Amino acid sequence: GPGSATYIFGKSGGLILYTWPANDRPSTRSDRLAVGFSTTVKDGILVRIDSAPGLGDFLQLHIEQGKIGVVFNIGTVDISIKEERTPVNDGKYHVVRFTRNGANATLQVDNWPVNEHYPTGRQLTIFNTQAQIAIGGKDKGRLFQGQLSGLYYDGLKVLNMAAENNPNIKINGSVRLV
Ligand SMILES: *[C@@H]1O[C@H](CO[C@@H]2O[C@H](CO)[C@@H](O)[C@H](O)[C@@H]2O)[C@@H](O[C@@H]2O[C@H](CO)[C@@H](O)[C@H](O)[C@H]2NC(C)=O)[C@H](O)[C@H]1NC(C)=O
Ligand SMILES: [Ca+2]
């Protein structure tokens, strides 16, 4: 709601970084990711979850040519799902919702027709030993500029945790709680 923690990222970019305590690093067969955003950027990474060093697994929510999508890897090759029909960089508030079940995924913006992707043949299922949630894209040189609100990832309200000064959150660069 109104109480959902909201952060503004400026033109110079910033990062909010959640690092799981070592023993708390999760492994999942399915994920759920959602965030409210407003932006005019043609390109930027909003959120990326990475596994521990040496493991290639990741899950990345990003905008490319004004269109929002998720690319992820759970141990085979990059799997992508995208809202290709309509751009989201119109400077209006949207909600993007993503689910993953093994190699399968869904993606919806607002109330638009749902995108679904079901890779064929033998697949892996586990997103192994997740180590960090990077928000804002600055670390990968694709900074997000705009507003992020009410980020939800697998039960974690990460922006709420940032706003509450969670000891496993680091914030730097051009980012501000509103
Ligand atoms: C990932 O998704 C596959 C395929 O999903 C099935 O096919 C269509 C996709 O076009 C989808 O709309 C249906 O809902 C259906 O689930 C899953 O594989 C299927 O699993 C179901 C339920 O266990 C079986 O009835 C089907 O035989 C089976 N089909 C195939 C082609 O294998 C798969 O389980 C799923 N992966 C995970 C981890 O959930
Ligand atoms: Ca894996």
Report the CATH number that the domain containing residue 69 is assigned in CATH. Answer: 2.60.120.200
C-alpha span between 33 and 47 (Å, rounded): 9
C-alpha span between 37 and 93 (Å, rounded): 6
Residue 152: give the domain boundaries: 1-178
Ligand approaching nearest to the C-alpha of 121: 1
Atom of ligand 1 nearest to the CA of 120: 31
Please give all residues whose beta carbon lies within 6 A of any atom in ligand 1, as ranges: 101-102, 104, 118, 125
C-alpha span between 69 and 85 (Å, rounded): 11
* Number of domains present in the structure of the chain: 1
C-alpha span between 53 and 164 (Å, rounded): 28
**Which residues in 104-168 belong to E strands, given as ranges?**
104-109, 115-117, 130-135, 146-153
Q: What is the CA radius of gyration of the chain?
A: 15
Atom 15 of ligand 1: nearest residue by CA position: 118
Query: Nominal resolution in Å?
Result: 2.0
* Determination technique used: X-ray
